[PDB]
Amino acid sequence: IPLKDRVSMIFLQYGQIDVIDGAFVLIDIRTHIPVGSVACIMLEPGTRVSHAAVRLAAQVGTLLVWVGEAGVRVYASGQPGGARSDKLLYQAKLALDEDLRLKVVRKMFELRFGEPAPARRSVEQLRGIEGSRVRATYALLAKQYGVTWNGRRGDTINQCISAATSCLYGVTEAAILAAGYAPAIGFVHTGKPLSFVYDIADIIKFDTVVPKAFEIARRNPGEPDREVRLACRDIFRSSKTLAKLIPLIEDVLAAGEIQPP
């Protein structure tokens, strides 16, 4: 039932996904996927989906994400739109107003860095400060883990960061959609299909997920995507990332000081 109670993510590798006797199944070796009990199903190259399976995924509120190598985003499908105009119009009202936007963004910063932003800065200036601090954190991680690093982008390490954060984004997009909001309307990031997903995921990214990418990349894996995905599955379970994302999305918007729906 609710997102809080679900498995984070399942990956489907290469065959046909279909519905047989009402059950969601992958076929090469038939395999039952418990589609209602997972937040996000990831579809790797060489996977074909039937109309029935896409429909049942939407029905039970389970996001479908098509990915390529290193989990790069190909596409997603789900229930059409937020069902509630009051949630959508609240988010849009916050995004469209410059003073309200700034409030949301200052709250995102504070939660990201555990300390409030310097006072009386614009959105653009806070992005610079955030940028600078993030580049320092990657460089410090590279040093600690003994990884060669010429910056964020194909380096093994950049493949690992990509695969890892692509996982987080899928689970973040699930939660945003469950909350009734639009992935495309962001506050820090703007102008991309997943703007809001980036804003929310970036708050929490560096707790364990990006660290784990370094931990894995220092073993010099040849084909890292598989190991990274299983580490992220483990992390989402142990950290209870889903239970964490739901209230974070509402706390961030509430910073605008507009009465929520």
Add this chain to the structure above:
Amino acid sequence: DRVSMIFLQYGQIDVIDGAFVLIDKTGIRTHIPVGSVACIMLEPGTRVSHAAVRLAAQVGTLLVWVGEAGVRVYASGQPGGARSDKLLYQAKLALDEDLRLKVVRKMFELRFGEPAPARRSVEQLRGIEGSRVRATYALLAKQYGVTWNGRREKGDTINQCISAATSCLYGVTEAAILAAGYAPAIGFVHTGKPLSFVYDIADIIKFDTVVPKAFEIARRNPGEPDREVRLACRDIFRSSKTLAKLIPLIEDVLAAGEIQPP
């Protein structure tokens, strides 16, 4: 730019030998011009390959999963909408009372072919629109020469056709709004429902499209069996000419706000 919408049913969609193609229930292979349409509505019995999805996403074409002939929408690509400029344009217009009323007045004009009366709230315009529905049916009956005793295997050929033709109105309209890049739930006349903007646009399409085409079908009827007439009535949204008008109608409605469109 791209306004065409197409349906695909009972077949496999894939990229074979470089070409984006449908292999239909018979085994015939047809090229689908994916980059040249705004939306592909995938009906039951479709199977899409990962490479087909990837090409559609590259060229920015929406995939929507629907019931037969558009009866309803079960899922959509890029959920919530791919573009913030479109979604924030719609919201801006919906949130400002002055802009909202201008949009609703444009809705009125497209529905009735003439300006509404000058000083009327959204609620009054809705009462008037309701006031005139009997007249519209009567005018279209006379336009097609079809005997008409009013809106009602339920009875009159013309009334059965109207009902069948109305059947996929809401699903196709919802698909067209998703294709134009807007939120179904953010309406202007109707508000508070998951499909409030669908209702607004579908009220226009019902008398600009559905009812005339139903009269057209009833009129040209040489006493065909009613099972066949009913099926052609249900299928009115399969025409390419019809489908192509829907996105531009939606843009025309929202453009009456006088804000520069995305």
